[PDB]
Design a protein around this ligand. Structure first.
Ligand SMILES: Nc1ncnc2c1ncn2[C@@H]1O[C@H](COP(=O)(O)OP(=O)(O)NP(=O)(O)O)[C@@H](O)[C@H]1O
Ligand SMILES: [Mg+2]
Length: 325
């Protein structure tokens, strides 16, 4: 079977075409934000403009027509209202025109679910991006969020720090490079708050220390990563300990980070459990993960009525019953 998926919760418009076993197409266009920040209205304009060209490119690279597609899937939420609405409108339009069933997909769930195409069965997921940071795992028939950010996503925290230092968007790779050159740990506030993550205190302290001129920038970048990532690993490990699951996945745009990967490898190896990171075009915001999750939902008998396709800006991860597992 084939599914077409449209992702557009934030600045990236992604269209994917997948089967149960493989990705046939995975195409991208991201709104250029040279000075970072969140731009919901510009993202919406971008998605609407790029919808037709990207759909054409996805169909060409997959080598199929829209008549070959079994189900249309879209990122229903959570995310930016104007951007979500463009995506949902486009998906509904395709569904009506080609008389296809439609499914709304939770963006956070999709990030974890895509790993199951690669043989992952039942993982603790660490989902880390610009605006999102969640540790999630299947419990009681739903994805339970064990810990999440109370303020800003780790990606955004790094992006703000980068901007302060004169490193333009995206900040992540640039801060990662600086961190590799660090040779001294500088004490910074720990980012675990109860079960959850909190990065605002860490970020503001790092900026204050930067403005003091007392430290090497590379040492601050190194310390920022060591502190923030150690927190991520702790929350992930706690979830593993409780759930007794034997695999961890790292997903989201921040999954590109080699240091974070290394820290998770160490933790999983010490526990004697598996660790997996999908190819990066399936880690960052993409349409293929939407297509795959949507297909699994459809095969489980899920098919949305029109009023069920209304966007959910604050879509909670635990709302969806995972009946396809
Ligand atoms: N090597 C890296 N280390 C740390 N952060 C990174 C790295 N590469 C990318 N990032 C961050 O990942 C984020 C981009 O992720 P991407 O999924 O492309 O968009 P997004 O809007 O953050 N996704 P979402 O929040 O899930 O809608 C940015 O904050 C980047 O700085
Ligand atoms: Mg992402």
């Amino acid at each position: 079977m084939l599914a077409l998926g449209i992702e557009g919760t934030a600045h990236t418009l992604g269209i994917g075409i997948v089967s149960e076993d493989k990705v046939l197409a995975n195409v991208f266009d991201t709104l250029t934000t040279e000075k970072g920040g969140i731009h919901p209205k510009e993202a919406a304009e971008h998605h609407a403009r790029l919808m037709k060209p990207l759909l054409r490119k996805a169909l060409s690279e997959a080598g199929v027509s829209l008549d070959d597609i079994d189900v249309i899937a879209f990122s229903q939420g959570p995310g930016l209202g104007p951007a979500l609405r463009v995506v949902a409108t486009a998906a509904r339009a395709l569904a009506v025109k080609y008389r296809k069933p439609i499914v709304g997909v939770n963006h956070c769930i999709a990030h974890v679910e895509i790993t199951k195409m690669f043989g992952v069965k039942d993982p603790v997921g660490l989902y880390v991006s610009g605006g999102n940071t969640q540790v999630l795992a299947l419990e009681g028939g739903r994805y339970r969020v064990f810990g999440e950010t109370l303020d800003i996503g780790i990606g955004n925290a790094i992006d703000v720090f980068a901007r302060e230092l004169g490193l333009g968007f995206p900040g992540g790779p640039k801060v990662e490079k600086l961190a590799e050159k660090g040779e001294k740990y500088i004490e910074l506030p720990y980012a675990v708050k109860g079960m959850d993550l909190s990065f605002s205190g860490l970020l503001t302290e790092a900026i204050r220390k930067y403005r003091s001129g007392k430290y090497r920038v590379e040492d601050l970048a190194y310390s920022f990563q060591e502190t923030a990532f150690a927190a991520l690993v702790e929350v992930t490990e706690r979830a593993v300990a409780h759930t007794e699951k034997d695999e961890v996945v790292l997903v989201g745009g921040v999954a590109a980070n080699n240091r974070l990967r290394e820290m998770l490898r160490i933790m999983t190896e010490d526990r004697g459990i598996k660790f997996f990171v999908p190819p990066y075009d399936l880690c960052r915001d993409n349409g293929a993960m939407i297509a795959y999750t949507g297909l699994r939902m459809y095969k489980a008998g899920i098919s949305f009525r029109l009023e069920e396709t209304i966007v959910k800006q604050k879509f909670r991860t635990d709302e969806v019953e995972i009946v396809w597992h």
